[PDB]
Design a protein around this ligand. Structure first.
Ligand SMILES: [Zn+2]
Ligand SMILES: [Zn+2]
Ligand SMILES: [Zn+2]
Ligand SMILES: [Zn+2]
Lengths: 120, 119, 119, 121
């Protein structure tokens, strides 16, 4: 059963590792895997902008580097801990590993990935 | 640099590879200038252009575990052979490793500065 | 909005598709707000993460031909059936078309705003 | 074809004026000679999600295939002031697929082979 406060705290903590000197907008993310472990990532920008990696990219990389599984929940936050909605690219990434019932943290209550990326 | 340890770690992480479209798993391990080792494996996607290389995982893990500069990288395929990073990954690595980063290669490691001239 | 013309131009351009890795060719055509039509096809790469969707070609062509906003898009597969853009491409299109951009679909076109909510 | 470097730079310079780069403010234009003689062009297109940015060379490669394919023979990439630029690593890998090691890239001293810009690809 999803501990949203754990996920947000983890996403806020990992945001400190963000490499975002171009945007000056650090982002952290934390996701609950179906075995119950949490994987994290932070954004990593590049001088060639189109090589930039979103925090959710880090999450999916760590998912598999730590043995795989399915994503159940995700929190993405700015430096100040405000929830953020994944970009379109990240919605497609996350859909591969979590499907439509993956929950994404949002101030009003979580959103299902299926609603954030219809007709996947 | 402990090349055997980096190769061992890259081989270990390659078992987690998510590569059902290419069926070409890859594992990568890098030494950070503070002594720690960070790892990644490739993660493909039905939209091919969203695929992440093992090296993208290494760079993500570098920063999620507190940043630093990369000193040495070993990438390995499923046969156990060293793999040269693709161009995208060379550019990625250059940002965090510069030209003196060493990449595992048969016979002896190569400098990233030679792999990506005029960066 | 001549959906027939957009679909035929998308089918035409799809014959130029470079998709030897997936064997899944895609063509796309978009009406720009000044009435002209810009096109693209998919272009894959041995490094899968470097693959370009047809819609990336549309967006590149939009700007290389002087810019504008996108009004309507048709994407087609090998059978000439409409395809929904991947999420990356939805974000791409949103930058240049916003929520009212129409995307061809069986039975009737869909708004980008519904395909990519909370943009 | 005989490579007309002047044509390729002029064409890259022209297309650079259409670059969509409101996040970096670093516009880039590119023009490539295809093996059938035609020139294809591209400019960079950035995105609010930085990692969705497309390089001028991505435009070049999309245009190549939208216009019937072939192999790239020469490329000129220019900044907003018309000065030559070297493609980024991603773009070297892209271009390698469509031009191989003998693709020439414009550079102030004289062109460079992609083979030298991307060894052991
Ligand atoms: Zn994203
Ligand atoms: Zn790579
Ligand atoms: Zn796409
Ligand atoms: Zn590039």
């Amino acid at each position: 059963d999803i501990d949203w406060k754990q996920l947000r705290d983890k996403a806020t903590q990992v945001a400190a590792g963000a490499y975002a000197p171009y945007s000056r907008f650090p982002v952290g993310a934390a996701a609950l895997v179906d075995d119950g472990r949490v994987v994290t990532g932070c954004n990593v920008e590049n001088v060639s902008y189109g090589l930039a990696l979103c925090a959710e990219c880090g999450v999916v990389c760590a998912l598999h580097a730590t043995g795989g599984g399915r994503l159940v929940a995700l929190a993405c936050v700015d430096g100040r801990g405000a929830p953020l909605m994944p970009c379109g690219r990240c919605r497609q990434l996350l859909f591969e590993h979590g499907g439509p019932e993956l929950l994404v943290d949002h101030l009003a209550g979580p959103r299902r990935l299926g609603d954030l990326l219809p007709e996947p």
